Amino acid sequence: EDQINPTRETNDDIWRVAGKFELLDRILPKLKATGHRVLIFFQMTQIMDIMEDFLRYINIKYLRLDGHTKSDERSELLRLFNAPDSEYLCFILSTRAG
C-alpha cells in the first residue's frame, strides 16, 4: 500500500488495481439504478476497511459490523434495516460473528 501510494489518500487506483473492484464500480451506478439492496460478506479487519473506502469513493452509504465491538450497536443496526426508507443499499457484514 505504501509503495503504490505513499499518500494513502482516496485514489482512483483503489478500484482499478483489482478485478472485483473494477466490476464493483460497474455495478455501483447500476445498483443505484436498480434500487435493490445488496448484502455483501467480507473477511475480518482488513477487506471491510478498504471496502469502506470504495463505497465511500462512489458515495454509496453503508453500515458495518464486527466481533470485538460491543453489543449495543448490534441490535440497533438490525432496527435500521427494518426501516424501508434507507437511502443506503449496500452494507458490510461478517462471516464468523455475523
Binding site: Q3, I4, R16, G19, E22
Partner: peptide
Amino acid sequence: KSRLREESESAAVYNGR
C-alpha cells in the same frame, strides 16, 4: 484508462523478506 511495472519489481524486492 485501462486496468494497468515499477510497483511489481519493488514488490519483487520488498515482499522477499
